[PDB]
Amino acid sequence: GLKKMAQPSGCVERCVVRVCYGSTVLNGVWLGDTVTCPRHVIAPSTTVLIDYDHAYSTMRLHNFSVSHNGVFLGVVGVTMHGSVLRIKVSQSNVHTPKHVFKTLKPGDSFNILACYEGIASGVFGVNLRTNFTIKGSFINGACGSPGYNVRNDGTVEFCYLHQIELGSGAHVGSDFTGSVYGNFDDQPSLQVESANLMLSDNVVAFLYAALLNGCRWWLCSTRVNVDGFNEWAMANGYTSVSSVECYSILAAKTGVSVEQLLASIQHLHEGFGGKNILGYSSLCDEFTLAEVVKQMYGV
Amino acid sequence: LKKMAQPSGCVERCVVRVCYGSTVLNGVWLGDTVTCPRHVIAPSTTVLIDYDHAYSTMRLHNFSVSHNGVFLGVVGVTMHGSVLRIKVSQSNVHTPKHVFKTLKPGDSFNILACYEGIASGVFGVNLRTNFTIKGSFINGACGSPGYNVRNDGTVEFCYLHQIELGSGAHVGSDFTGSVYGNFDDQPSLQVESANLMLSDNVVAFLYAALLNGCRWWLCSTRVNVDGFNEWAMANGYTSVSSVECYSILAAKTGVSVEQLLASIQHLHEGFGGKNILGYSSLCDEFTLAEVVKQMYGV
Ligand SMILES: CC(C)(C)c1ccc(N(C(=O)c2c[nH]cn2)[C@@H](C(=O)NC2CCCCC2)c2cccnc2)cc1
Ligand SMILES: CC(C)(C)c1ccc(N(C(=O)c2c[nH]cn2)[C@@H](C(=O)NC2CCCCC2)c2cccnc2)cc1
């Protein structure tokens, strides 16, 4: 069946550093001569709302300690951009991979390298949900852990920097420009996220994977078009489906149109009746179209 | 809880592409030795493979071995069980501090899934009681390594991918050439035994549930280890190995292992429409160590 996996982490591990300001420690990402980290590393050890403009104005460069594998880098300057700091260091990372910065959209899959004290401990795949949170596995100190994707040509897309955990347990991050996904605050406030929607594009991909693994009991004989599904979706907690043309690869290899799968989703939403689909007892929005194509065909 | 893998960078630097004639798979380069599945020298044939004949007629110049497109000189080859040890003309300067370790059912480990000597994915898996794993491998994944990283940084190399069974289950060897479950590296049928639920992992899962405030399912009944183990063998579960390793979580929750053994018996047939941490049936994916590491970092 399908397994969530991560892309290999080697090229990203060499960019992880330990960033300390005063007593506070978290992780940063060292690319060229710049270390990016969450700005809340300079927050005071009080429990009130943080005034970041005052925190930044009173910042002292000598209070920073930035290190990679216990080797200390010299801090040259620091600027604040949204919810991140860009710490200029006197040494460029000789292991900087070919890379770009990319802002995720809901439904995008990516990889997390979970880090503590500047040392990677785990790697896993995740999906950005419609409420702009992820379900990671993080403990205290994971802030600044990077999320990434690796393109076919080897370019690393840096797309997520871990920021905070919500009361629900959901995880919030920024991109490398400092924009927080979902515009949550890097504050000790109570923040309740919107409810997540089922990612209809992923459920379609999952059903195509089921057809390709011989699992076909659930297949509706009839069809519903995109307009009818999207009307149903917004009344039943699903996203609108993108476009039928995106699935041309899987539609061609199975001979099943997206509209047949949309009809099947409407049936299966009410329940499976004790049966399962690839080990799942309800519809699965964990896997993207591209993940299904890669895991089935290597493309 | 999230199944995750330990970082792969130090193992990526050991993956090589191994080719014999037209056949390509992966190998693992440590020091001046590349280990790979011996079936790379199998003839293009539909018949059972005579490996002693294939080995005695092997010629070194039919091998090509490369790391990230850089080809290595091949100096000699020996056969050990279901693996070859290819001596190459230089040592891997990025060989990590490492040992070889043979897995036992119930051990978690990491797989670096590789094709043509290039890693494409990394994930955690459990060695099941039928000595197979549920990977996501497609053709060409043979030679993909399995590993664990010790706290001191030592890499344990524990799995080399060998074959896929008709069921889709995956079979590998250790680095001494012993195939887990003693499956054969042959085109024959081969059916693995029925998989058993890993009771040690299910107990850990139920403690994680308790620690997350999910306790609708908790039994006040107690079943002792001996009684549980007798029930387990008749109900598709492994024995529970021991109780004392759970004592930290038992103290935090106030719930004994024997209560969770009773709860497994209560929940074994299903949850009746409810869920535990989002699962609709008992989960044996997570070890005690994983639950303790992911919730407390220890
Ligand atoms: C300063 C500020 C913005 C209030 C803050 C304080 C602590 C952290 N958290 C650090 O772990 C951490 C480590 N170094 C610095 N912060 C944890 C975190 O989000 N707690 C609280 C944040 C707001 C109130 C509810 C929970 C954390 C992050 C990821 C996974 N699990 C725990 C994040 C932001
Ligand atoms: C020579 C021998 C022993 C018969 C053989 C042939 C092919 C392979 N398989 C290679 O993909 C592959 C790539 N390079 C060399 N073999 C695949 C594999 O197991 N097929 C068969 C093996 C026995 C008969 C039924 C299935 C494979 C697919 C997906 C994940 N894992 C392995 C393994 C062993």
Instruction: Tell me the resolution in Å.
Output: 1.5
Among B68, B94, B108, B122, the residue to mutate for chain A (most A Cβ within 10 A): B122
- In the three-class reduction of DSSP (H, G, I as helix; E, B as strand; rest coil), residue A121 is classed as strand
Note whether A124 contacts B9, CB cutoff 8 Å. Answer: no
Q: Tokens in use for A115?
A: 């880090």
The amino acid that residue A118 corresponds to is G
Tokens found for residue B7: 């970082």
- A157 pairs with which residues across the strands? A100, A149
Q: How far is Cα B148 from Cα B143, in angstroms, rounded to an integer?
A: 16
For A264, left (φ over 0), alpha (ψ -120 to 50), or beta?
Answer: alpha
d(CA A126, CA B196): 29
What does the alpha-carbon distance between residue A14 and residue B114 come to, in Å, rounded to a whole number? 21
Nearest to B278 by CA among B218, B223, B220, B212: B212
Total CB pairs under 8 A between chain A and B: 90
In 3-state terms, chain B is what percent helix, strand and coil (to 5)? 25, 30, 45
Q: Judged by CB atoms within 8 Å, which residues 160-179 of B form the interface with A?
A: 168
Question: Contact B190/B165 with Cβ under 8 angstroms?
Answer: yes
Task: For residue A108, give every residue at least 6 positions away whose Cβ sits within 8 Å of its Cβ, in sequence order, or none.
Answer: A127, A128, A159, A288
Residue owning the nearest CA to atom 4 of ligand 1: A188
Nearest-CA residue for atom 34 of ligand 1: A164
Task: Give which of A147, A171, A143 is closest to A157, Cα–Cα.
Answer: A147
Strand partners of residue B59: none
Which tokens in the block code for residue A266?
């409407």
Q: How far is CA A151 from CA A99, A100, A102, A174, B102, in A?
A: 9, 10, 12, 21, 35
Residue A40: CB within 6 Å of ligand 1?
Answer: yes
For residues B277 and B209, the answer to whether their CB atoms sit within 8 Å is yes
Q: How many secondary structure helices (H) and strands (E) does chain A include?
A: 7, 13
Which residue type, as a one-letter code, is found at position A290?
Answer: A
CA of A143 to the centre of ligand 1 (A): 7
**What are the catalytic residues of B?**
39, 142
Expressed in angstroms and rounded, the spacing between residue B22 Cα and the centre of ligand 2 is 14
The strand ranges marked E within chain B are: 15-20, 23-30, 33-37, 63-67, 70-72, 74-80, 83-88, 98-100, 108-115, 118-126, 145-149, 155-164, 170-173
Helix axis angle for A289-297 and A200-212, nearest 10°, is 20
Query: Quick check: CB of B140 below 6 Å from ligand 2?
Result: yes
| d(C-alpha A129, C-alpha A265), whole Å | 19
Q: What is the largest CA-CA distance in chain A?
A: 69
Going from the C-alpha of B51 to that of each of A129, B17, B74, B110, B185, the distances in angstroms are 51, 21, 20, 29, 10
Long-range contact pairs involving A127-130 (C-beta distance under 8 Å, separation at least 24): A127/A199, A127/A202, A127/A285, A127/A286, A127/A288, A128/A104, A128/A181, A129/A196, A129/A199, A130/A106, A130/A194, A130/A196, A130/A197, A130/A199, A130/A239
Residues in chain A followed by a break, C to N above 2.5 angstroms: none
DSSP B60: G
Q: How far apart are CA A146 and CA B1, in angstroms?
A: 19
Structure-derived torsion over alpha carbons of residues B276, B277, B281, B282, reported in degrees to the nearest 10 = -90
Show the tokens assigned to A213: 């693994």
Contacts of B43 (CB under 8 A, 6+ apart): B49, B54
Cβ-based burial of B151 (10 A; exposed 0-12, middle 13-18, buried ≥19): exposed
Q: Which ligand neighbours the alpha carbon of A171 most closely?
A: 1
Angstroms from B1 CA to nearest CA on chain A: 6
B188 alpha carbon to ligand 2 midpoint, in Å? 11
CA A24/CA A40 separation, integer angstroms: 9
**Which residue in chain B has the smallest CA separation from A15?**
B9
From the list A268, A132, A105, the residue with the least C-alpha distance to A195 is A132
By CB atoms closer than 10 A (0-12, 13-18, 19+), residue A271 is exposed
Give the Cα separation of A175 and A183 in Å (integer).
Answer: 11
Phi, psi for residue A70 in degrees, rounded to 5: 70, 10
- The CB density around residue B290, as the number of other CB atoms within 10 Å, is 23
- Amino acid code (one letter) for A133: T
Q: How many whole angstroms separate alpha carbon A56 and alpha carbon A39? A: 9
Please indicate whether, in this complex, the C-beta atoms of B4 and A114 are within 8 angstroms of each other: yes
d(CA A12, CA B7): 10
The partner residues of B147 in beta bridges, in order of sequence, read B110, B157
Q: Is B103 within 8 Å of B176 (Cβ atoms)?
A: no
Interacting residues of A293 by C-beta distance below 8 A, sequence separation 6+:
A249, A250, A299
Residues of A in contact with B9 (CB under 8 A): 8-11, 13-14
Q: Which two tokens stand for residue A259?
A: 């509209």
User: What is the A165 CA–ligand 1 centroid distance (Å)?
Assistant: 6
Phi, psi of B64 (to 5 degrees): -135, 130
Instruction: Provide the shortest C-alpha distance from residue B52 to chain A (in Å).
Output: 34
Residue B212, Cβ neighbours under 10 Å: how many? 13
Torsion of CA A253, A254, A260, A263, to 10 degrees: -110
- Nearest-Cα distance to chain B for A204, in Å, is 20
Closest CA to B65 of B39, B28, B38, B94: B28
From chain A, the residues in CB contact with B115 under 8 A are 298
